[PDB]
Each structure stands twice: as structure tokens, then as C-alpha cells.
């Protein structure tokens, strides 16, 4: 039937409270949401920057010290997931629609609308690619590495349930069960659901922009919700039996077609410029790492960071329980240093390669003289990928491949996240029998539809920033508790 | 009865030789002092930069290697200072009065009078804060860390008196007592006395400047010496028995009221700008660390470094034996890595926090449009803190708190410097009974009058620069001898 | 008799095929050499940058890890060198003639013809010195450190002959003997022969330009051929018995007179500017290390890298069998970490000191107002050192000393290179006998004649870039094989 801690009922109550906030106040929520979002990010952007930087340098320290000799699941455990397939399986479920919606719109947006004042067009493009490298580089995956390492260590080496409530066992003891770890699990479930709803909204907005650009359709008002309902239905079918699609084979096939799409853009585009720009921009991002990682825009105060950088940090921090729990169930016998390296460096380098392959080619097209992408981004940032594919051979085929790639990207993460929310709100792995995951996928669809009806992109950014604000202190306490637990486990072993 | 090494007589003779050189030919020494100072700094600024960078790089190496596993006073020794009080008590006889004089007058001066050319005001403020972070950051405290570490290791592990004569014990034999280590003690006593006279002259160039700004008094020149005589009398009272003031309670309550003053400026000022600028300026100072650490201004040759950067390095290197010997008295059972970390990083970060809290708020007021601090600094740099406190609520109360803060800041340092000088010129802890303490404090005050009458801030700069010039080779030989001693001691562990 | 692997006769056939391509159809080779060179570097400059950066960071890692505890020649090898003779005989034979050619011609060229655009003139001079520091710094000697360390480890710790055929022993096993290490031996012999011919051509055009500027003579190509024939002749009667030059005597004397020449320029020039610019430019080169090490000039596409930095990386990579084999025979018992430090840091710092002493003094002369060096470099780059010595006391004596220094520099490398080519082309150490060292020196000279007659600088750059193109993959496979060999050897220690 139904199993419930009191983390269930008040989570549903908070979700429906935001629902009637966004449906009984239809015109009064379009001014409450961006004002509250702007106040939260303008007062805590320094805290988001400090949290992300502390998390990343803690990942580097935990990989490159004596704490990296620990192996998850004890010294007798085996990896069992065939590391080349493990990289693909962690990349497919843990990423999307980030490298499709924002692979081109973000470097062009940083080109024409610069973060800090710049002199020429070449230096503006260099700054745009280095800020894209900041937003999709080591800082994006250091949070993922910390949460996956903490959840894997405290779910394997300590025999606790793989839950954010049970992660603070060395910091707080067995009194986490008495309503004081319930708030942590409430914030974890809310952050996972709101991040998945933000990804859902970005995916459907890019899909309807591509459908309007390709065939000249008119799906603004209503069948967008039908696209949501169809996608959640096929995702729950993949959750349902008959075939276990969306766990192992669909992730590998999706990564294969994503690599084929990226290689096709790399070959058909300016490959020499792409390779030289990849080397140059990776080196310039590593050289100016501390300068752009801790940049807070305090002197100019232009507010560029509040829509891009702090939104990205709150977005990656709000997807942290879902991807951290997924790679924590995945990595059963990895060395801790090897785990942090394989979650940090290799997916970070692959994401930087995707950013270079798309954004550097777009900036080469812009610097050649073609400024149609600038006007397309200034119209709406959702058509940037398809406008980029317009000046390519096989435009319609590549646009259809991109639409199918987005479709697989946000049909994999919803399937991998429904079980994560079910494990958070049920307290077990096999339990419950499979009806609540369909309800949680439908809740993600309902929240995405409601947020997109009561506001554009800014409603999703608002929701993800507000649920990621207390996760800064949650992840800092998580990092300190992981350091204490690793000290305890290393002092335990001979 | 008095005690008598030769260092006492042929250091007193040097002191009264400079007294005779300045009190006779009064107008003629104003052309010998800054010309000789300018020659020394223009010919050895590269050497000062090389010495400070080598000391800091050596501190980072000695903290993060196998030499950091050594513990002072043997392995069985336990520290007894309750470390949260140790951080404050090294900070009292330690940092100061440099924050209270140059926390505001230095970033405004680097704003309007830039070291290197800039293009706007935002970049000028960023470069001003990063040069301030260079001058009051890790390079400041690394010198203190090495002198304290060398004196503690060669006075606790080697069972020698903590004197600079015994600091070269592995590099030589027992030949230190035969007139060739006496010059080292001559330069150490002169460095302590001249640096404390520079700090006293700066603190008395201040305080009464705020008295003039508050009450419109006329004070100079005759009643200015009365402030010196009164604050030396209270310092010698703190030397005297009955109550042991200026040692522990006045080294903790002063830190408490200084932290309360910093928190009051942080709260009543632009706290969001202060926090964001603190994070951004600390990150930009760490990012551009090697670019501003080794900058010698060779191509421009403007001589900006000659009055700020090389003066600051000569001031730190001239205050080396004072706080180095006192911290070596302080830290008995600290681990070497823990010692270097807690003397370098945490006081450096706290000093950078004070720099950001005052200078970033001053730069925010300047960039808002208020350029009264610019004209105030262009008039005289003594009144910059009080002009900054003018537009704050409770101006008179904060200025009185600042004056009492400066008073306690150098009245602790004068007592600890009398301890250090009467330890160095004695070669013994207890002896002599207290009559040279009052004599050495009175000599410090007399040098303050003599230097302040024959020039303002400039003559103090000449005295500290010419006196700290041979301490560069003294500290380089000290670092090499410390490496030899650590390599000798670490091989002795069974 | 003749030692005849097929490596020898098909290397001879390749060399005479280049002879037939050059002396027949001279306009065809003169129009096809810079086009093919430009195509190769424009398509693989990113690969040259990646290879050089990977080799350098691999040197830093493999010196600063547990692989550095291995000692060449076993644990009781006793290296038989004074650490001064090793450095001097390493520096004299393994460097040239860009210390005499590009010490002044390169920073002045980077001054007036900037790599990337700059605003003022001081920034142009700083950029020129930091790009000279990039070209003559750690990247220049990291390649030598890896090739010398791999050849020394695989020739001493494995009892294998010092040849690039045996350098891939843990990658293929015993398959290196049959026609598969043969091609690597062709590429190695062609690389060292073409690099030595490039150095011979640079030295003789500098000698010709210096004689023309000194005595006002005219130079025919047949007189230049006589200079080559005489210089190869003194080398061949240095190879012959009776007397040996050096084997270390000529190298030590050349190092002594080079140090005396550098000290004379340092003393008689602007010594304060030289020292301050040395400290500042070394710090700025270390600060902007990653930014200029991976800069590929992708956005501008100006082709500044085309003639300067990819030619430099192909030149240092093409001299790698020569210098690597020579340093490998030189050092018999050095610790691997100590070896990489003594080949990387100290010769890199000495080369940066020479670069600062000459180029910073030239830039001081230019920034003072004397712009005759700009017009001299714009006329011909081979007269820059002598034009610099024209505005210098003792012009004729210093020019004669510079000519003798060039003479020693390009007789010592040829004398050490005939032995290296002979050992590579025969497969055995010595016992050739001396009939083909003279022949290989004559072939080196003849290749220099035909490269100078069929083109100026561009033919030498073309030849060295073409033979250095497959050595990028050869050195990457070499680095991976060295890592596998060190991992195999370090596990063999009980």
C-alpha cells in the first residue's frame, strides 16, 4: 500500500502549497518570484561561490591525500561496472539538457552581453569561452563527486541507508531520526524534484522552439503540456515492466548517439579551429581558475552573475542528491581517489570538449561576420542550437537528431530520479511496490507545467535558486561530516 | 650592579651616535636621510623582494613536507596556551599598529596614485585592494613564521638561549661568542629598537591627528612629546610589579575590542559589499600572487615601490626578532606544520579581513562618488581613518574607540619589545633586575622624538630601511641554517 | 669495414633523395618548402603544444612522486661527476646556437612584432620577455630531461643499448628488431642530423653577418661553403686521435668563456635594470605559465606562432635524440628526481638568466629611445647581437669574443653529434671505427650547404619542422613507455 515517514505528507503539502500559490495567484506570482529570487541571489551569491569553491578544493584534497587510499565497500570489493561503460552511464543520467540548451546560447550570450567590461571582439570571445568553461567544468562535477563520495562511503562502508538523512551519522549520532534529519530529507526531495522540473521545462522549451523553427508549427499555449504528459507517460512506461529501459542500455545508446552527434559537429565544422580553441580555452580556464572561480561582480554590480553563475551553482547543487545517490549505488568498489578523479576530471573534460565543439564553432561563425546567431539569441535563447545547425550540412537531419538527443536526455534522468525520490521518501530500496514512482514523475510533470504557465525561464530559475539556498549549508555540513567519517574509517583500519 | 656583554655598549654607542647625528646639523640631516634611503631601496628592492619571496616559499615548503612532523620541545611536549587564546596573544604583540594607520590610507593611496597604469576606476580599486592584500597578507606573516620557527626550534629542541647569536649554531661552531656573532645581536637589537621606534612614530603621527580632527586642537610640536612620555610611563608601569598588565589580560581584551570595532564597521557599513569584496579580493590576490609578489617596477621606474612595498618588507624584516622571539617564547609544544599554518594562514586571513572591512568600504564610498577621502589622503595620510569614520554613525564614539585601540595596540608591543631587547642584550631570561627595561623604553621614546622632529613619516622610513637592509642576508643565512638544523634533527629520530 | 643495418643505407638514400630534390629544380623546392612547412605547422601546432606541455608536466610529476626515488644504474652506481662538471658539459654540448642567435633577435622581434595585441609599450616589452622566457625556459629543457632520463634508465637499469629502438622495450618487447624500430631509428637519425644542420646554418649566417658588420667584407656563397668546410674540418681533426677535444676540456672552457661574456655584458650594461627585470620577468613567466604555454593563437590566426613557437618546439624536439643520448651517457648514478631537477630547473634558470641579461638590456636600450636595433632586426635578424654590441664599450673585442663563442658552440655540438649519429646508425657503442664519424660530419655540413643555398632561414625551419612532426607521437609513446618501465622497475624492489 502506502509507506510513509513524516517526510512524505508535508512534502506533498509543500508541493501543493506552491501549486495553489502558482494557480490561485496567477498574476501575483509573476512579480513575487523574480523579486524573491533576485533578493536571495543578491544576498547569498558570495555564499554560493564560497560553497562551490570549498567543495571543489575539498574534492582535490580528498583525492590527492592519504584519504584517497580508501576503497568503497571495503578492500575486498570489486568495481563490477566496467569503467568505460561506467563513465557513459554516469554521464547519461547525470547530465541534460545542460549541454543542449546552454551549449550555444551561453557562449553567444556571454559574447554579446559580457560579464565584465572588455575591449575587443577576440577578448570577448575568450572571456565567453572561459566563463562557459567555469560554468561547465571542474566546479560543476566537484559537487557531484562530493555527494557521490559521501553517499557511497556512508552507504557501503557504514551499512546505513543511502539517504541524506543518514549521512550525518558521525556528526550527530542516532538522533537524526527524530525530526532533525527529516528537514534534511525534505530539502533533498524538494531539491531533486525542483531540479528535475527545471530540466523538464528547459527540455520542453527547447523542443517546442525546435518544432516551431523546423516545420513552422504554432505550439505555444496548450500542447506543450501534452508533450510533458506524453514524455512522463513514456518515462513511466520505461519505469514499468516489460523491459528495463532507461537504466543500462538506453543510457549507453544515448551516450553513443550523443558522441556521434558531437563528432559530426566536430568534423563538419571548423575542426582545426575547434581543436586549437579547445587547447587554448582549456589552458586559459586552468590559468585564470582562481580569478574567475571567486569572482563576485562586487565593484561593477551589473547583476550578470545573478542569472547565470549563481543560478548555475544553485542548479548543480539542487541536482546533487539525485546524481550523488545514483553514482553512490553505482560505484561499489572504486578507490576514493579513483572515484573523485573519474567523476571530476574525465566528465569535466568531456563537458569542456562539448562546450568547445559547439560554442567555439558558434563563436568562429560570429567572428567570421555572420551575426544572425546574435540576433537569434537576442530574440529567444531557446532557438540557438537550431540556428547554429541552420548553417550546417544536413540541417533537418541534425535538428531531428538533436531533438531525439534531448528526448533521451530528459527521459533518462526522470526515470533515474523517480527511484531516487522514492528511496528518499520511503526509507527502503525494494519497497514500495511500483506505483509511487509514477506519482512522482507525474508530480515532476505537474510542477514543470505549472511553473512554465506561471512564468517563463525565470520561474524555473527562481524555484531552483530558492531550494538550493539551504543546500549550501547542507553541503558544507556534509563535507565536514565526510571528513570526520573518513578520519574515523582511516583510524579504524590498521 | 649591571650586566655587560659588549653588545650593550657598542649598541648604545650606535644609538647615541645617531642621536648626535640628528640633534646636531638639524636641517642638514633632512638631505642625508631620504637620499640614502632612496639609494638603498632603489639598489636593493629586488633583493628585498627575493628575500621575502624565498622566506614565504620556504615556509610553504616547511609546512607541507616531512619537516613538519617535528614538534617543538620534543615529542612528549604538550602545548599550554589554549589555542584560541594563542591566536589572539600572538596577534596583540604582533600585528599592529599597521592596521589602524594603513588600513584606509594605503588602499585610497593605491587608488588615486596607482602603482601601474590602469584604464578605469573599478580596475584601479581592484589593483589597490590586491596590492593591499600583497602588503598585509602571506608575505607579511611568512617572515614572522620563519623567525618564530627558527627561534623556537633552536631554543627548545637544542636547549639554547633564544637569541639571534645562537640561531646560527649549525652553520658555525662555538665561534658565535667570539665577536663574529656579536654583530648579529647588534643588528637584532637595532632592528627591534628601530622598528618599534618607527611603529611608535606612526602611532603618534596618528592619534593626535584624530585629536586635531575631532576637537580642533593645536598640539605640535612640544606637547607631542608629552604623549610619548606618558605612554612610555604607562608602559613601564606595566613592566613594573603589583599587576602584570600588558602581558595576558591586555593582550586579550584588546583583541576583543579590536574584533568588536571590526564587527561594528562591518555591520554599520556596506556588509554585502564587504563580504563579496572580501571573497573576490582574496581570490584575486591568490590568483595574481606570483605576478604581484615578484613585481619590481623595473620598466616604468616610477619609484612607487620605494615608499610602499620595499618599506613594508624592510618593516616586517626589521620587526622579525621582536615578534619572532616572543612567539618562540609562546609556542612550546606546537607541531611545526601546525605552527606555520596557525601563524601564517589564520593571522594572514584575519589581517586580510580587516583590510577588506576597512579598505573595501572606503573604496565603496569613493566609487559611490564621495571623494572627500581622496582629498583628505592628499592632504595628509594621518587622518584617513577619522575622515572615514566621519560619515559613520556614532562618529565621536568610534573615533575615541579607535584612539584607545591604537594606544593599547602599541602599549602592548612596547612592553613585549622591552622584553625582547632585555632578553637579547642580556643572554639570560631573569637577569637583569628591572632597571634597563625603563631605560630601553625611554631610549625607544627618545629615538621616537629624535626621528619625529627630524622628519615625519619619511625619517622613520629611512631608519627602518637602512636598518633592515642587512637583515635580508641575516634572514637568508637563518633560513639555510634552519634547513640544516631540521635535517640534522629529523635524522636523529631513532 | 662497414656496420650495416638497413637503417644506415636507407637513411643515406633519404638524405641523398633530399639532396636530389634540392639541387635539382631549385625554384620548385624554393616555392614548395615554405608552403609545406606552413601547412604542417598550421595543421599541427596544437599537437606540438600538447606534446611539449604533456612532456613538461610529466617531468614535474615524475620528479615529484614516488618514481623519483629510483636511481639510474642501480642503487650502488656512484655517479662519478662533480655536479658542476655534469652541468657544464651538459650545457655546452646540449645547447646552441640560439643562445647566441636569438638572445637579442627574438625579444626585439616580439617587441615590435607582437604575438598578440597590446596597448602600451611597457606591456609589449613585458610580453616579449615572457614569450622569450616561454621559448627558452622549462618547456625547452623538459624534453631534454625526458629523453635523457628514458635513455639513461633503459640503457643502465635494463642493460640495453642506448638507442631509440630499445627505448620502446616494454611496449613491444622483442618486436623492435624487425623493421618496426627501424623506422624510429630513421626518424631519430634524421631528426638529430637535420637539427644539427639547422644549428650549423644559424651559426654560419650569424658568423657571416658579424664579419660583414665588423670588417665591412663581402661574402660569397662559396666563401660560406669554405667556412662550413673549415669548421667541419676542425671537428674531424678533433675526432682523430693524438689529442681529444674536449672531451670535457673544450666544453668546460667554452662554458667558462660564455659565463665571462655574460658577466661582462651584465656588469658593463644596466646591471640594476637587468637584475630587477630578471626577477620580474621570471615571476611573470611563472605566473602566466599556463596561459602562454597553451596559447594556440586560434582566434587571431595571425601566424606569429608559425615561424616562432612551433619552429621552436620542433627544434627542441628534433635535437632530442642528440641531447638525450648525450646526457644519458653523461650521468650514470643520478637520482631520477635529482636528474630531472638538474636538467630542468638549473639549465632552464641559467638560460633564462642569459635571456634576461641580453634581451632586457636590449629592451632597456630600445625603451630609452635608441631604436636602431629595431631597424637592424627589420633589416636582418642575424646582425642583432653585433648591433647591440656596437652601442657597448669594447665593441670589437666583444664581437670577436662572441664569434669565438659561436665557433666553440657549433664545433662542440657537431663533435658530440657525429658520435650520436654513428651510435644510432650502427646499433653498437663505438667500434665503428672512425671512418664514418668524419663522413657523418661531412654529410651534416653538406646538408647545411644545400639548405642554405636553396633558401634562407625558411628552408632550415622547414626541414626541422618536417622531421619534428612524427617525433610528437614518438615522444608521446616514449613517455608512456617510460611510465610503464618505471612502474615495472619500482615494483621489482623486493
Residue numbers in the entry:
A (entry chain C), B (entry chain A), C (entry chain B): 11 to 504
Question: Can you quote the paper on this entry?
Answer:
TmaT forms a homotrimer structure in solution. Each TmaT monomer has 12 transmembrane helices, and the TMA transport channel is formed by a four-helix bundle.
In comparison to the electron densities of TmaT, additional electron densities at the potential TMA-binding sites were observed in the TmaT-TMA complexes, indicating the positions of TMA molecules. Analysis of the TmaT-TMA LCI structure indicated that when TMA is located at the substrate-binding site I (LCI), it is surrounded by four aromatic amino acid residues (Trp146, Trp151 and Tyr154 from TM4, and Trp326 from TM8), forming an aromatic box. In the structure of TmaT-TMA LCII, the TMA molecule is positioned at the second substrate-binding site (LCII), which is downstream of LCI within the substrate transport channel. The LCII is also composed by three aromatic residues (Trp325, Trp326, and Trp329 in TM8). Comparison of the TmaT-TMA LCI and TmaT-TMA LCII structures revealed that when TMA enters the aromatic box at the LCII site, the side chain of Trp326 flips inward and acts as a lid to control the opening and closing of the aromatic box. Upon comparing the structures of TmaT-TMA LCI and TmaT-TMA LCII, it is evident that the proximity of TM3 and TM7 resulted in the closure of the substrate channel. Analysis of the structures of TmaT-TMA LCI and TmaT-TMA LCII suggests that after the binding of TMA, the hydrogen bond formed between residues Ser95 and Asn262 may play a crucial role in the transition between these two conformations.
